[PDB]
Design a protein around this ligand. Structure first.
Ligand SMILES: CN(C)C[C@H]1CC[C@H](N2C(=O)N(C)Cc3cnc4ccc(-c5cc(Cl)c(O)c(Cl)c5)nc4c32)CC1
Length: 321
């Protein structure tokens, strides 16, 4: 409805549609006070019913996962009929596009990308979650060519070609072991440009996945081949631990330090220039304003603070309209 938007258009001006998923439309928009571009995920609550609790788990998860390689949530706005999620804009497109335009990535370009994936998924597990839909369509590049993991609608506590054998059998599974399998599929796709398990017929592809045999192209280094085998194990108990992936020898090559998985931001002190400019727009003193930001309700103040922070990092004036 029109009233479903009046709160949102107080804070954002809508631009074009940039994407449409199952239950959601994603619009490019401009945060009015900072001028920063953002993506707004729009969902209609009536249209969704059974995955309405899915969205609440996605939102709860995104508020608990602040990380340099996880698409950052700025603002949650719920109305009578709508739920709006204001998110970090990723103009660089999907990892899918990068791969398909390059045909395939060299081992070096793969590891540049893969270390960022490992970074994000290890942090997700450290917070008690599992993604469960890891795939190149759910990994976007921002404008600095940094990867951002998206779509926690299927997160725990999927796309068939990336699903672990035990999920295809309808069996019990651990979320982290399923993420490691999917990351093994991702690493194959990065370096080959095609899937290790594929078939036009779904039952035939069920059987290929559970068997676990895949072609090994001649351009794969021996080291790449072994890491592929340690992640793509049909028995989830024999798949490499996330802990052992962080400083795996193939991961370390050309870097010599393990994957930094810890969040770079945490919940440190607030940036002084940001809270000062905020307080100049809010009829409150600085301490009161600092207290309000620390509640992190993902209202408009959370969004203004985080985007004024991003705009400061951009080298632009620390100013609001
Ligand atoms: C088709 N899929 C099921 C979803 C599709 C939605 C559009 C999206 N996109 C695009 O397609 N561009 C072309 C640009 C683009 C730019 N910035 C974005 C910023 C955030 C997100 C985003 C989307 C969703 Cl559904 C999320 O849950 C989260 Cl946490 C984040 N998507 C973006 C996005 C790509 C994936």
């Amino acid at each position: 409805g029109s009233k479903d938007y009046d709160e949102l258009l107080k804070y954002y001006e809508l631009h074009e549609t940039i994407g449409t998923g199952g239950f959601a439309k994603v619009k490019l928009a401009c945060h009015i006070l900072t001028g920063e571009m953002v993506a707004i995920k729009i969902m209609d609550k009536n249209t969704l019913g059974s995955d309405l609790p899915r969205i609440k788990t996605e939102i709860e998860a995104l508020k608990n996962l602040r990380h340099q390689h996880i698409c950052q949530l700025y603002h949650v706005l719920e109305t009578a009929n709508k739920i709006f999620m204001v998110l970090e804009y990723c103009p660089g497109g999907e990892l899918f596009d990068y791969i398909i335009s390059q045909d395939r990535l060299s081992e070096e370009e793969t590891r540049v990308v893969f270390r960022q994936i490992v970074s994000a998924v290890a942090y997700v597990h450290s917070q008690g979650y599992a993604h469960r839909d890891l795939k190149p369509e759910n990994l976007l590049f921002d404008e600095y060519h940094k990867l951002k993991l998206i779509d926690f609608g299927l997160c725990a506590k999927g796309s068939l070609a990336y699903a672990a054998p035990e999920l295809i059998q309808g069996k019990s599974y651990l979320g982290s072991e399923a993420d490691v399998w999917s990351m093994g599929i991702l690493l194959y796709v990065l370096m080959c440009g095609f899937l290790p398990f594929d078939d036009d017929n779904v039952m035939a592809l069920y059987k290929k996945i559970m068997r676990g045999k895949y072609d090994v192209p001649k351009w794969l280094s021996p080291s790449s081949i072994l890491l592929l085998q340690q992640m793509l194990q049909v028995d989830p108990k024999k798949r490499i631990s996330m802990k052992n992936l962080l400083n795996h020898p193939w991961i370390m090559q050309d870097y010599n330090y393990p994957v930094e998985w810890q969040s770079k931001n945490p919940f440190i002190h607030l940036d002084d220039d940001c809270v000062t400019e905020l307080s100049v727009h809010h009829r409150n003193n600085r301490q009161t304003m600092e207290d309000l930001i620390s509640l992190w309700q993902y209202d408009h103040l959370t969004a203004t603070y985080l985007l004024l922070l991003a705009k400061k990092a951009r080298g632009k004036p620390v100013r609001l309209r």
